[PDB]
Amino acid sequence: TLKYICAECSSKLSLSRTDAVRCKDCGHRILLKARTKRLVQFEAR
């Protein structure tokens, strides 16, 4: 499930290519792309 957070409502959501880019709980038009459990390697320096 892809996720997109409402910049103004904190409500988690899962946008689709078939829906309006808006917070369904707030109505905002700005969305932070949520971080997920994805592996990234790091040199501990």
Partner 1 sequence: GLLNLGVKDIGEKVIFDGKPLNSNSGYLGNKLSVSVEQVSIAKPMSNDGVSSAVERKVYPSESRQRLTSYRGKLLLKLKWSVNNGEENLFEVRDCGGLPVMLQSNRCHL
Partner 2 sequence: KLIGHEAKLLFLKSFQFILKRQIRWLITEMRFPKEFEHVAKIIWLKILKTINDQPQEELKLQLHMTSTISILYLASTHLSLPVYTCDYIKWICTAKMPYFQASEILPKSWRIQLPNYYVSILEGSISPFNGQLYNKIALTCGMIHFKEFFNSEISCQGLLLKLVMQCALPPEFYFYTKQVIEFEETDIRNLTLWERTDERHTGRVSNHAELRVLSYFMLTINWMLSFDRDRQYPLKWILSLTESLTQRTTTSESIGRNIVKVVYPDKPTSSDYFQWSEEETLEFLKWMEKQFLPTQTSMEMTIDQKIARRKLYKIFPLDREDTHQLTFIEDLQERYAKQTPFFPPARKEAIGRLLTHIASQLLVDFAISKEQLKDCISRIKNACLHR
Partner 3 sequence: YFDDTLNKTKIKTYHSSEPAYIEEVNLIGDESNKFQELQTVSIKYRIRRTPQIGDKF
Q: Name the residues that contact partner 2, by CB under 8 A.
A: 19-20, 22-27
Residue 6 in marked binding region: yes
Separation between Cα atoms, residue 20 and residue 39, nearest integer Å: 30
Residue 37 in marked binding region: no
Length of the chain: 45
Site mask, partner 3, residues 19-38, x = CB under 8 A? xxxx------xxxxx-----
18: left (phi over 0), alpha (psi -120 to 50) or beta: alpha
Residues making up the annotated binding site for Zn(2+) are: 6, 9, 23, 26
Interacting residues with partner 1 (CB under 8 A):
7-8, 27, 30
